[PDB]
Design a protein around this ligand. Structure first.
Ligand SMILES: O=C(Nc1ccnc(NC(=O)C2CC2)c1)c1ccccc1Cl
Ligand SMILES: O=C(Nc1ccnc(NC(=O)C2CC2)c1)c1ccccc1Cl
Length: 539
């Protein structure tokens, strides 16, 4: 379970906006200054306080243009509070009820498309929202003015569901999937979506409004079909969505297929960038989370921006521009400081962040730890094929969205085709405890040096980045100074110990990787099959 930690001092609570199940929503401010909303959870049952925190987790590990941003969770005495993105026009059903008779079906189709896109995203990630209703859809941009179009953000689902009472599940009918009545199918969000489309078509009026909880239950028991909307093939889409048998409900790829058919660059300006938080310090500078809102309408995208010799900084940007791979951090563009002042690197925001901070948070097993390892090799083997040495492979520089992403290209160099190794004396810091004996002793960097660097990250994966059991601390226990004592240590054959509960088979690879002679080390291409075979072992 993962979300960012928010302090009680950072938040301020404002006007009460309304109530959700077991919650009281407030406008607020985040001192990281920032307009937010505070969903406050009433002092409640553990089973439900956890299902609230489970939601914050689902939402802190996702990144989509049509999903409302979760800043983190804060504890203000007896109450659990979640800091969410404040959206200008608020709950969609409320808005539709007030805009009754001034909303075209063209406008509703854009919304339907956007919502389906946010759920198509969740579907690919095998994640379930569970509370898709117009109240949990927020209106950022109106889209009523000529030349414009609506923009929505699907908000957090609040307390889980099923964690909730049965007579509360009955109150959520017809948004509630019928299978969910006896107290998790990804098929439940295709029922909620279809029920939401009816809510949207009927301009905020809930279908089955004038029915008692007992009357609602009867409708589901007797399986009466839900009302047909306005028109056209939307009634077809709605109907398939609203099938009591979950297996018959169409996929969000098919929903978004039907919807897209029903229809009629690298320059970032500092002005449109609005900081959220800092993300970490790397080689060359700080990475900070930004929001890039060019239209100022609160519909921008979340980017990671890195700042701050100048020549070697440019090199970081030039290398990253030319790398396209599933496990390497993605280049987006550039930002110019001031009149010649400096250049800024715009990247993709990686929801779960560095492994170094993620690992001592839920002691994840061999299946997960090894999956990461094989991927770092999948990403490193591609880097090496592009004729570059990394020189900075550590767990601090390995990011993860789900469950995966290799960053910090500050030390990466290009090896000219002919040359065996690359000489670098430095004039900066270097992760010595992740460097091979030839790197420390003679300043020589072979492709083989990154493989040494790998085995060291592989160690951290298995120590769960334990600060007491870490490459700098453990290699220093062996002494009682610099790289010189380290050089002789490794030259004797002395290695980092085996982490507790590290399968001996895994610790063999680390040893293979920590070969003194660089030419005796396995290649990154050679390690992928080896890691696949082993990853198809610890289940
Ligand atoms: O979704 C809610 N509120 C949100 C979330 C983010 N932004 C807003 N913005 C506004 O309400 C603006 C119109 C004033 C509301 C909300 C508010 C009260 C009660 C229950 C819920 Cl679920
Ligand atoms: O790129 C870096 N960090 C990034 C980039 C994109 N997303 C994240 N995500 C987070 O930090 C999560 C916790 C919010 C980190 C970064 C920062 C310092 C050192 C090495 C790297 Cl690879």
């Amino acid at each position: 379970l993962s979300f960012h930690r928010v302090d009680q001092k950072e938040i301020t609570q404002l006007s009460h906006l309304g109530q959700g199940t077991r919650t009281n929503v407030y406008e607020g401010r985040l001192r990281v200054e920032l307009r937010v909303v505070l969903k406050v959870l009433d002092p409640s049952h553990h089973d439900i306080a956890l299902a609230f925190y489970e939601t914050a987790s689902l939402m802190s590990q996702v990144s989509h243009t049509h999903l409302a941003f979760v800043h983190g969770v804060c504890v203000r005495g007896p109450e659990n509070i979640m800091v969410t993105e404040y959206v200008e026009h608020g709950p969609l059903d409320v808005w539709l009820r007030r805009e009754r008779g001034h909303v075209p079906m063209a406008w509703k189709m854009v919304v339907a498309q956007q919502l389906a896109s946010a759920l198509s995203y969740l579907e690919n990630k095998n994640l379930v929202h569970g509370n898709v209703c117009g109240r949990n859809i927020l209106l950022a941009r109106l889209g009523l003015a000529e030349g414009t179009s609506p923009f929505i953000k699907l908000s957090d689902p609040g307390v889980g569901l099923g964690a909730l009472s049965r007579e509360e599940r009955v109150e959520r009918i017809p948004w509630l999937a019928p299978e969910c009545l006896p107290g998790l199918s990804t098929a439940m969000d295709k029922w909620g979506f279809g029920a939401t489309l009816l809510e949207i078509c009927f301009d905020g009026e809930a279908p089955l409004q004038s029915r008692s909880p007992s009357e609602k239950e009867h409708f589901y028991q007797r399986q009466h079909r839900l009302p047909e909307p306005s028109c056209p093939q939307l009634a077809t889409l709605t109907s398939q969505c609203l099938t009591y048998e979950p297996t018959q409900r169409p996929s969000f790829r098919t929903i978004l297929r039907d919807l897209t058919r029903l229809q009629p660059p690298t320059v970032f300006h500092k002005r449109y960038l609005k900081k959220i938080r800092d993300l970490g310090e790397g080689h060359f500078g700080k990475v900070s989370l930004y929001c890039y809102d060019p239209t100022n309408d609160g519909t921008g995208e979340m980017v990671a921006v890195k700042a701050l010799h100048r020549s070697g900084w440019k090199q970081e940007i030039d290398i990253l521009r030319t790398l396209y791979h599933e496990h390497i951090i993605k280049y987006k563009g550039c930002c110019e400081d001031q009149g010649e002042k400096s250049l800024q690197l715009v990247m993709e925001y990686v929801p779960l962040g560095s492994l170094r901070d993620y690992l001592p948070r839920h002691s994840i097993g061999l299946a997960q730890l090894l999956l990461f390892a094989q991927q770092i090799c999948e990403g490193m083997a591609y880097l090496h094929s592009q004729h570059y040495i990394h020189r900075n492979l550590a767990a601090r520089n390995v990011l993860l969205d789900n469950d995966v992403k290799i960053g910090d290209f500050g030390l990466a160099k290009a090896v000219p085709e002919g040359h065996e190794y690359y000489r670098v004396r430095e004039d900066g810091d270097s992760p010595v405890f992740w460097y091979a004996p030839e790197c420390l002793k003679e300043y020589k960097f072979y492709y083989a040096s990154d493989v040494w660097s790998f085995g060291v990250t592989l160690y951290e994966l298995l120590t769960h980045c334990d600060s007491s059991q870490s490459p700098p601390t453990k290699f220093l226990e062996l002494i009682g100074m610099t790289v010189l004592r380290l050089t002789e240590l490794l030259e004797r054959g002395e290695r980092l110990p085996r982490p507790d509960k590290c399968p001996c088979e895994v610790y063999h690879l680390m040893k293979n990787c920590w070969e003194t002679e660089a030419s005796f080390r396995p290649t990154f291409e050679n390690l992928i099959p080896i890691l696949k075979t082993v990853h198809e072992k610890y289940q």
